[PDB]
Amino acid sequence: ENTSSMKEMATLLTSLGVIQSAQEFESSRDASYVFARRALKSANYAEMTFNVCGLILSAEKSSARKVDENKQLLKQIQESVESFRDIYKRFSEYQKEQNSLLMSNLSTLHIITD
Amino acid sequence: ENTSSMKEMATLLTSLGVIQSAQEFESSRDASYVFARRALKSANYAEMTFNVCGLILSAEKSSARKVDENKQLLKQIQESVESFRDIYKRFSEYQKEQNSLLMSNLSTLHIITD
Amino acid sequence: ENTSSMKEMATLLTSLGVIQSAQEFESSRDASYVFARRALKSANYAEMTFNVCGLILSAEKSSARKVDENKQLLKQIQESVESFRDIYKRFSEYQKEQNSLLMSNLSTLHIITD
Amino acid sequence: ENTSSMKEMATLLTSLGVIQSAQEFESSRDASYVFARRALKSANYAEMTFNVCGLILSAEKSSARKVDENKQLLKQIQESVESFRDIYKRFSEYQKEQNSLLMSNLSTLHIITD
Ligand code: EMC
Ligand code: EMC
Numbered sequence: 001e002n003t004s005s006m007k008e009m010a011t012l013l014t015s016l017g018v019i020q021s022a023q024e025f026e027s028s029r030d031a032s033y034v035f036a037r038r039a040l041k042s043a044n045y046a047e048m049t050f051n052v053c054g055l056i057l058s059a060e061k062s063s064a065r066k067v068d069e070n071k072q073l074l075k076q077i078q079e080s081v082e083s084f085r086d087i088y089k090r091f092s093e094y095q096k097e098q099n100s101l102l103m104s105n106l107s108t109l110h111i112i113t114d
Numbered sequence: 115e116n117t118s119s120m121k122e123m124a125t126l127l128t129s130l131g132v133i134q135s136a137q138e139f140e141s142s143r144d145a146s147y148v149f150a151r152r153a154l155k156s157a158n159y160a161e162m163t164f165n166v167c168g169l170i171l172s173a174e175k176s177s178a179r180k181v182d183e184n185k186q187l188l189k190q191i192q193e194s195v196e197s198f199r200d201i202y203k204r205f206s207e208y209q210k211e212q213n214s215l216l217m218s219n220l221s222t223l224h225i226i227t228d
Numbered sequence: 229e230n231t232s233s234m235k236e237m238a239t240l241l242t243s244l245g246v247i248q249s250a251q252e253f254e255s256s257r258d259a260s261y262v263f264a265r266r267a268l269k270s271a272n273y274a275e276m277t278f279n280v281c282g283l284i285l286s287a288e289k290s291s292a293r294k295v296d297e298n299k300q301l302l303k304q305i306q307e308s309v310e311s312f313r314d315i316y317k318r319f320s321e322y323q324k325e326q327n328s329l330l331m332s333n334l335s336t337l338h339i340i341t342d
Numbered sequence: 343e344n345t346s347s348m349k350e351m352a353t354l355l356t357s358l359g360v361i362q363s364a365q366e367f368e369s370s371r372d373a374s375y376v377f378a379r380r381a382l383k384s385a386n387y388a389e390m391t392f393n394v395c396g397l398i399l400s401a402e403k404s405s406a407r408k409v410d411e412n413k414q415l416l417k418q419i420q421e422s423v424e425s426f427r428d429i430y431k432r433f434s435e436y437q438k439e440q441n442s443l444l445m446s447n448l449s450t451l452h453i454i455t456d
């Protein structure tokens with residue numbers, strides 16, 4: 001409906017450091033930005049409110065995806081540390097075993113206790 | 115009040131990749147989406163503003179829950195690494211002990227210093 | 229201005245699982261909820277818009293604090309793993325040393341190479 | 343347009359603990375707060391809606407950056423644990439080797455099996 005405000009928004013978001021370049025604001029296929037553009041090019045309160053509703057849901061969903069990416073990384077770290085501990089447990093147990101086998105092998109060299 | 119816009123929103127959210135299927139938008143028991151639907155089917159600014167308020171609080175709460183899930187995972191990883199370190203400490207100390215017991219057992223084979 | 233909608237919101241947020249009990253909605257000193265209540269008890273668009281602005285900034289800030297809590301936990305885990313690695317490095321090096329001291333002590337028992 | 347509400351907001355955000363000091367609200371170069379101030383000093387619904395749109399996008403972007411900071415920390419922890427495991431694997435293998443070399447060196451002291 002009107003590219004004036006869309007233009008001013010792109011410039012302002014860039015100057016504020018929210019986006020790296022204006023072309024990025026407009027154009028972008030990002031749900032949040034799509035709804036924002038549609039909101040700026042709205043001329044009636046039914047389109048505007050519709051588009052703001054869409055902007056809020058898009059924002060919520062994109063943030064949720066990023067938090068879920070972190071959750072997956074945490075799950076990988078958790079299982080990795082768990083696997084590590086159990087490899088360490090198996091090894092330590094083996095080592096304690098080797099130690100006693102070694103001390104016993106060394107008992108066959110004693111002059112006393114036989 | 116009006117399923118037209120609700121219908122257009124479901125389609126748009128799907129096409130934008132915000133949701134995987136439209137039926138998911140409508141129907142869903144998600145607080146954010148419940149308020150969004152109620153907001154679209156509003157015909158007066160008192161219901162609309164009421165529903166937008168609810169949408170923002172629902173969004174904040176759902177994001178907070180996801181961030182809290184990550185926090186719990188971090189606490190589990192932290193205690194797990196701590197437990198691991200202390201198992202390693204106990205083991206290393208035991209090993210250093212076994213070493214000296216071994217070197218001493220080997221001193222009973224020296225021809226000198228006795 | 230009007231406790232009717234505040235009442236309906238508390239009930240709805242509870243039924244939707246956003247909050248655990250209605251008394252919690254009203255009353256709560258949470259910035260987001262304070263502004264939400266003020267927004268519901270608004271009767272003019274100047275108070276309403278003022279209160280919605282406050283609600284969005286409060287939401288952003290509370291989410292930022294929770295994400296920062298996770299960041300602190302991550303920093304503690306990172307330094308903990310780093311400390312652990314270096315304790316392991318020091319120990320392994322010590323062990324490799326003990327090994328060669330042991331093999332050499334065992335060379336004083338050879339019948340050949342002397 | 344009007345510093346009255348901007349003034350009341352700064353005071354309220356401070357009293358609610360959202361910000362630590364009022365001067366911080368006004369002044370701040372934070373995109374979210376810039377748009378909030380512009381929203382309060384709006385006198386027409388075209389500027390207001392413009393500024394609220396900007397506030398929501400700024401909020402989304404700042405939260406996304408913080409979540410991305412956590413993501414980077416998680417990647418560093420993941421690779422760190424992976425590197426650690428593999429140093430442990432290499433060492434354990436070396437140790438098991440030293441053990442058998444030791445047991446064999448000890449077989450040259452047997453009175454039987456030769
Ligand atoms: C008026 C925002 Hg759906
Ligand atoms: C006008 C959004 Hg409570």
Ligand code: EMC
Nearest residue numbers: 277278280281394
């Ligand atoms: C009209 C929300 Hg500051």
Ligand code: EMC
Nearest residue numbers: 052391392394395
């Ligand atoms: C009316 C918020 Hg862009």
Ligand SMILES: [Ca+2]
Nearest residue numbers: 070184298412
């Ligand atoms: Ca996180």
